[PDB]
Amino acid sequence: NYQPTPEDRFTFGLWTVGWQGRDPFGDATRRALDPVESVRRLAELGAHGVTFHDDDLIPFGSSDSEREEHVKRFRQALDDTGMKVPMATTNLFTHPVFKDGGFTANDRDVRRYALRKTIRNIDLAVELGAETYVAWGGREGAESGGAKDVRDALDRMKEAFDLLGEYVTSQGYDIRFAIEPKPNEPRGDILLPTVGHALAFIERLERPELYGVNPEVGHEQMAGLNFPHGIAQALWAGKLFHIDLNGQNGIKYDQDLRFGAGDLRAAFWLVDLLESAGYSGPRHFDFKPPRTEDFDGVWASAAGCMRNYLILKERAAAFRADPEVQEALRASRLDELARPTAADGLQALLDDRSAFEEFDVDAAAARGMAFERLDQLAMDHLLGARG
Amino acid sequence: NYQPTPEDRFTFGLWTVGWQGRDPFGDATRRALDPVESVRRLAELGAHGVTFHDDDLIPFGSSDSEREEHVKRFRQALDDTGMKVPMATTNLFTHPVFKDGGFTANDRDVRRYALRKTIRNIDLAVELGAETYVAWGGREGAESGGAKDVRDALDRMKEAFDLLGEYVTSQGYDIRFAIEPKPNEPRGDILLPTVGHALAFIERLERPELYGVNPEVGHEQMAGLNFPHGIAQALWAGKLFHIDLNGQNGIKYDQDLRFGAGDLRAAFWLVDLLESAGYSGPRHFDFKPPRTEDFDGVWASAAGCMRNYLILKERAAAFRADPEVQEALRASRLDELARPTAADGLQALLDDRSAFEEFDVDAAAARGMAFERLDQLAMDHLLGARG
Amino acid sequence: NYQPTPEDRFTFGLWTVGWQGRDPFGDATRRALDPVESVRRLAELGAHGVTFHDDDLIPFGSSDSEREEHVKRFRQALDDTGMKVPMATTNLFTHPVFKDGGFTANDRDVRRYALRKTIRNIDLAVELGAETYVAWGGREGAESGGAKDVRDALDRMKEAFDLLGEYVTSQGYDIRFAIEPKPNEPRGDILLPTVGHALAFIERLERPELYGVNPEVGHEQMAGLNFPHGIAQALWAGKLFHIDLNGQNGIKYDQDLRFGAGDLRAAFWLVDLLESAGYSGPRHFDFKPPRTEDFDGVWASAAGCMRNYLILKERAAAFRADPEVQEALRASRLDELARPTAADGLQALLDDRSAFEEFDVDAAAARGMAFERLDQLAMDHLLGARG
Amino acid sequence: NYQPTPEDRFTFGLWTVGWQGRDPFGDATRRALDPVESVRRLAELGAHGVTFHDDDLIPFGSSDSEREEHVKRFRQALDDTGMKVPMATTNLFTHPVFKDGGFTANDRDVRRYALRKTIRNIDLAVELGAETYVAWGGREGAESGGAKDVRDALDRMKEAFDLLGEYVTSQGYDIRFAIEPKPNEPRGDILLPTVGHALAFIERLERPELYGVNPEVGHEQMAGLNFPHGIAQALWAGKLFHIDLNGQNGIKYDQDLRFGAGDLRAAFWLVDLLESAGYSGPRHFDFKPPRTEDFDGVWASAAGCMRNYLILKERAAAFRADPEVQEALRASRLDELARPTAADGLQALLDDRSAFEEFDVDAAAARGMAFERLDQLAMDHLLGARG
Ligand SMILES: OC[C@H]1O[C@H](O)[C@H](O)[C@@H](O)[C@@H]1O
Ligand SMILES: OC[C@H]1O[C@H](O)[C@H](O)[C@@H](O)[C@@H]1O
Ligand SMILES: OC[C@H]1O[C@H](O)[C@H](O)[C@@H](O)[C@@H]1O
Ligand SMILES: OC[C@H]1O[C@H](O)[C@H](O)[C@@H](O)[C@@H]1O
Ligand SMILES: [Co+2]
Ligand SMILES: [Co+2]
Numbered sequence A, B, C, D: 001n002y003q004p005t006p007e008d009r010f011t012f013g014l015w016t017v018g019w020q021g022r023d024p025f026g027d028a029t030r031r032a033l034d035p036v037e038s039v040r041r042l043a044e045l046g047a048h049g050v051t052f053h054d055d056d057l058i059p060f061g062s063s064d065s066e067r068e069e070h071v072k073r074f075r076q077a078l079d080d081t082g083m084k085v086p087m088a089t090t091n092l093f094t095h096p097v098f099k100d101g102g103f104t105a106n107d108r109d110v111r112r113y114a115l116r117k118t119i120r121n122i123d124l125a126v127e128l129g130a131e132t133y134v135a136w137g138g139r140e141g142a143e144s145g146g147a148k149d150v151r152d153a154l155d156r157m158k159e160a161f162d163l164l165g166e167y168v169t170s171q172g173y174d175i176r177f178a179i180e181p182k183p184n185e186p187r188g189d190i191l192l193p194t195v196g197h198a199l200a201f202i203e204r205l206e207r208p209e210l211y212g213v214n215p216e217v218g219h220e221q222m223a224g225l226n227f228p229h230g231i232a233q234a235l236w237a238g239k240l241f242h243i244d245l246n247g248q249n250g251i252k253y254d255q256d257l258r259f260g261a262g263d264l265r266a267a268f269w270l271v272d273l274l275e276s277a278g279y280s281g282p283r284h285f286d287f288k289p290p291r292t293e294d295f296d297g298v299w300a301s302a303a304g305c306m307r308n309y310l311i312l313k314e315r316a317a318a319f320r321a322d323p324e325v326q327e328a329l330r331a332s333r334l335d336e337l338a339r340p341t342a343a344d345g346l347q348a349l350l351d352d353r354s355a356f357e358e359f360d361v362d363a364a365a366a367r368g369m370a371f372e373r374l375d376q377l378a379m380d381h382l383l384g385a386r387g
């Protein structure tokens, strides 16, 4: 079973299945993919849609004429398949001009160029139906302490995003921005390194309602953080506009393994959260088929992304629907966590002797939380061993 | 040289020099310190003031009578020395009743107790002259995914902090709150794990102006993050109310080494930022003398904290005052980072052909940033090798 | 199903289920367990045997008289249940005298004491039937660079282990030593931090055949290493004398979660290796029930250790027995890895033009490894989704 | 001051200063360097010598004719400058044929090719005067558990190194091998991931005297290990044949910063060890000038490598020569660490009541180690603040 269909909202970046396998120590192991072929092959696997950087679709430095022919070909393929383009983004990291950043490059003329390059692709993104425009500032940062005044850099970053929002607002576009955090690589430290830092920064923008986050499983895991917890906080703030799904084995370089690889239990708790919170955005895969693979392995790895999501969804639904799990949740007082601590108010709390003067601290301390039995039920459900 | 004086604003927690050296695998190696003796010994070392958890000063479970005698003794010592109490905090982590948290414990009655325990110590803190009240939620979190609904937990955490602000507001107290993040330990994952997550959460509180952060060097380093960058972001947001200074060697358990130990270059860039941003709060040391040490080693380690700050301050001031460093900063275009990207406005940017159509991307890409020469000047200044 | 029986060779340390839950920031949450009660409760869960530190069984500082009464009581419990004692070890880390180490303490008289304390417990271990004597040097190490001359420390460590082997040899005991590595905690860096370092060091001992390793899942994971790979290397060397099973979420403090928690796919590949290599030693659990739990949660967590091993064993056996997996292994050329590279010899290799001069490097480079399809079969088997 | 001269034995890889700055997310920012120009520019900076991969010097796929012209040009440059070639190595990682490894590729014909490619460059290395031949198995490893049988892979790795030693032995070459460990990148996990694992593996080779290690500062730091401790263990074993010097900020991708950047105190303790142990091999820099830099920044970064070594050497010599530091070392009993624990023998130890029965454990436990005062003296010396 576990066959994906378009209703599952699975999307892929052109740059994922199209990764040629060049890494810091090795040349490409696969030939380039025509974006048209990717659209058609992904349609046939059950995907909902594709996403793109400007430079994935239009080779850098293309004339106005060549650009229009690349776009018309791609549009033809989308029209033939019904495939959607829910998200687009800008490549502000590959070309050598961006070696010190785009929006926060020390050189002012690079920052202006970065903004104009971005603005041009927003126009295309909106024409193609994108609802979210992602910004990953992979070159915004430093290898050394004196190279970047971080307060000035944040001024410039706020300036850039404020201008993008003025632009979308002035055009009447119905598109929103999502900032994708990453703690490091390819810069020694990248600005806004986690979901938390990006959420804080959004609250200083002129129009914070236009901006949310695009968290990536493996990126938060490169800081050793709990990805489901961070997604919970982004949901709680109302800012989970988009999400990048993949796998990562711990704190090391950015692996971009297929979703479900890496930390499998984190993947389980992630799917449980997304589904029980009713997240309705794309399930987007930002992953790289390992460079050991040929083109058959590329499509196997892509199918595996969707397969693992669908299996985990099933196990998480079975977990929450199990009356034994519901009983375990009550034994662990998850339901008391949802009750307000003091809806009776501050004065009532202060005058309540049962909350302090007469509180039996030893009796309360003695109560087991019963968390291990609950977690073993979760393990049994994940492994399909409830029998 | 490098003798500290009270004007340097160095402060210490009672629980730092007073750490008896019990760790997860070993019993105490030092006898307990009388808080009065700590105040006097710290005064003689040059400290500005001390800080405390409620339970450092008043043994847990003390009667109203015993509590008043502990406080009067301590007040006597402060009055005799002129030592200040700029910050206080609550112990919501040692007693077994807090094993699932304080403000976000699943059990409602523990959460109510946690709030009443906190409120009582705010009253004492304000009476003693504290300007900042720190909250470190070291038990707020989980070892397993099903144990904590993180959205409900954030509701309860917001509820608790909103009530604390209502309380200080209703009493007319002039005291502000600072949330201290930590990514893990003693819980498997702790809620609000970084400076970023804490900053974001503050923006959802009813009265965000009452709350800032208390970042700790070693805690952000337990997520492998760049501590100066995070402090820069907290300054940029106006939320650096307090700071914990210490050392940490990488991603492992929380070491709480004396300041300057651990990542020495990060300490250098930290001091350079605090001094050039004009941070005027306490330089507070949250550190543990290693349990190898006797009481002479405790006071040597404490003196070393202040000594290393003063040496680094001197090297950072010499760095910024060096005309060769100023020249290097200009060669790296740090001054162009402070110029607005587009103060001419969005329409002018769109109509500027030099920012895109006629932008010579190859010429710009060819410009070296000269960052290594600048960083070697910083190294030479840190090592006192400018000769 | 998945009921453990004594034939499964599951063992537990007295100090695991008996952990009272004192951590660096909190007091005990559970009362102490009588070792007799642990033996009986573990027998009833299906365990094969127990292990112990000297100080778990005999309170430190006991008289010759009290010691004999503690041991006779324990022996009575083993005799009543048929429970075995396959392994024992020394506590050279809790008492303050060991704060700078046991075998590599700077003070010579502590090192002599450490050896005499160890030798006394070897006698007891052998009397009780232990086949392996584990050494975990948790205090051997340093927080600072100048505190320990590491070459001299390794001399002292070799000296200590050489003396232990002379002792067992002179007594004619049939017991072997296993060194348990850990990279850090409670010391800033611990000597012999990984399986690799311990294996190398053994080769410099006078009688290397008496010494192997006791690797712990979570310890190698605290260095971000691949635990199955390290176990493979220890097997390849013939030195896997014992093993500690538990779980760990990444690079942070030592969590000692129940086995199967933490990195679940690593647990799967671990069980697959142990079973396909025919490891016949104890499956020993060195874990801590979280301090959130009461005594019912202690025994639930312990049962969960054995349960997860048995489930993973089943999934790994099904994986290897699947003809589709066998086909996938051949497509990935795992069988060609077992063929010698050049059993024809060096001169034949040098004269073979097909290995260099006429080797079609492009054809070989083009071959996909088909690793993702193989790994998705492994995922399907782990999740019980082969249907 | 701190001017390097050839007597300082500083060496550089052609691939360091010649790094064009292509990273996983960006194209080259610098033009290629002619190896002849590197030799001459490095001679003028004070370098002792250069090192090379085969493919740095001879473009891959060169004819016998083109190869001889590349080598003669390079030889001319060495002869003109007196520059030495103390070490050489093989590129078994860039070409797509090595995507699953060289010596441990699943495909047998790739392994044979890998050996023939290596053997050809040993001949050249010896002709040019190299004393050490380094092997870095950067593609030996896996992204997934089923892809590599690690025991079979270690068989193949031992087979390959045994054949290389037979070859050098049969030719009568006076050259030795050094294995360079790395824990991960570009493979998900690399075989022999640390200095420890490499040392253990050497002891299973047919002729272990021909093999040692080439540890790299940043590589051991990618596992969060203490690099000086690991070097101490390699010295203690007699296996430090070569060393790679650079910098790394923690557990993340391999940064290859200039030496002295990254963990500065670790660099200090490293230089103190190398100099006090009398290491007499090359001080080799395996580093990458950041891709932000132009060619002036390349040579500034290279000079900085040597500069920082010379400054740290001076500070470490001043540290050890300080009578106050000698006094501190005695107070911390570093001199008692060098005394044998029991040169009186096992029977004398067993019969010594002062080592156990009459050992005053409380008196010994009470002794402070005085480590913090010693470490603050080390800090003062590193920072040039002894005044
Ligand atoms: O933002 C779009 C994408 O850009 C790059 O490919 C990044 O590596 C990826 O993290 C991000 O999702
Ligand atoms: O908040 C006050 C202090 O509480 C605890 O001692 C924490 O370990 C420390 O991180 C914090 O600063
Ligand atoms: O060696 C016996 C045991 O000693 C301690 O309890 C260690 O924490 C554990 O790692 C080890 O297995
Ligand atoms: O072995 C020679 C060198 O090969 C590669 O360039 C590696 O990245 C470097 O780590 C190693 O020293
Ligand atoms: Co990624
Ligand atoms: Co801390």
Ligand SMILES: [Co+2]
Pocket: C216, C218, C219, C254, C255, C256, C286
């Ligand atoms: Co452990």
Ligand SMILES: [Co+2]
Pocket: D216, D218, D219, D254, D255, D256, D286
């Ligand atoms: Co490197």
Ligand SMILES: [Mg+2]
Pocket: A180, A216, A244, A286
């Ligand atoms: Mg992404």
Ligand SMILES: [Mg+2]
Pocket: B180, B216, B244, B286
């Ligand atoms: Mg703190």
Ligand SMILES: [Mg+2]
Pocket: C180, C216, C244, C286
């Ligand atoms: Mg263990």
Ligand SMILES: [Mg+2]
Pocket: D180, D216, D244, D286
């Ligand atoms: Mg190297």
